[PDB]
Amino acid sequence: GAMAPSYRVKRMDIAKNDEECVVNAANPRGLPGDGVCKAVYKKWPESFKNSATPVGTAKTVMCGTYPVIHAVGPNFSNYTESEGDRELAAAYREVAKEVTRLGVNSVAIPLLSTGVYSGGKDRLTQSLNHLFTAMDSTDADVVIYCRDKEWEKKISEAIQMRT
Ligand SMILES: Cc1cn[nH]c1-c1ccncc1
Ligand SMILES: [Cl-]
Ligand SMILES: [Cl-]
């Protein structure tokens, strides 16, 4: 575990993270995809061997000894708000199981279902709160990665609010 487990936020490419493992915002079919998933494919392509997994699940594949945790959030274009919310919560619970199993002291994590799976809605708060629900009981240092300047401020404020 980390000596004083923390949450932090950085605005940069998650493919340049400084953590012991990464969470991919994966598609269910293990395809290169776009956004976070395409950056992860360019950086760790070996991790896409048998990475296909259903919505609401996470599957880890090693690139050398570096763990890539493929987490499949729901596409809110296809799911109801209610069913999508349940699957988004579930994907983050499976990420917490994998992080714990791997014994890492730190993890780089994007906000699941906030980009092309958002169904055109702002889901910063919904996605971040499910991340916290899952990860609060883990003792890894969590570093959240984003690309928007206004999102960085709002994520930083939400972390600071809990102190
Ligand atoms: C969060 C986000 C949205 N569009 N692209 C990204 C991104 C891309 C690569 N690495 C990390 C994040
Ligand atoms: Cl997304
Ligand atoms: Cl962002």
Provide the CA 79 distance to its chain's centre, in angstroms.
19
Q: How many CB atoms lie within 10 A of CB 12?
A: 12
What residues does ligand 1 touch, defined as CB less than 6 Å away? 13-15, 35-36, 39, 110, 115, 145-147
Distance CA 46, CA 96 (A): 23
* Torsion from C-alpha of 56, 40, 77, 129, nearest 10 degrees: 60
**Closest ligand to Cα 114:** 2
**Distance between Cα 140 and ligand 1 center (Å):** 22
Contact yes or no for 6/145 (Cβ under 8 A): no
Contact yes or no for 62/48 (Cβ under 8 A): no
**Distance between Cα 34 and ligand 2 center (Å):** 9
What is the chain's Cα-based Rg? Answer: 14
* Secondary structure of the chain in HEC code, one letter for each residue: CCCCCCEEEEECCHHHCCCCCEEEECCCCCCCCCCHHHHHHHHCHHHHCCCCCCCCCEEEEEECCEEEEEECCCCCCCCCHHHHHHHHHHHHHHHHHHHHHHCCCEEEEECCCCCCCCCCCCCHHHHHHHHHHHHCCCCCEEEEEECCHHHHHHHHHHHHHCC
Determine whether the annotation assigns residue 143 to a binding site: no
Contact yes or no for 17/146 (Cβ under 8 A): no
Q: Which one, of 78, 33, 65, lies nearest residue 52 by Cα? A: 33
Method used to determine the 3D structure: X-ray
Judging by DSSP bridges, how do beta strands 66-71 and 7-11 pair with one another? unpaired
**Distance between Cα 68 and ligand 3 center (Å):** 20
Q: Which one, of 62, 71, 65, lies nearest residue 30 by Cα? A: 71
On the CB side of 126, CA atoms within 13 Å amount to 20
Choosing from 11, 16, 24, 36 the residue with most ligand 1 atoms within 8 A of its CB, the one to mutate for a pocket test is 36
Q: How many CB atoms lie within 10 A of CB 55?
A: 20
Provide the token pair at 63: 């690139």
Please tell me what resolution, in angstroms, this structure has.
Answer: 1.5
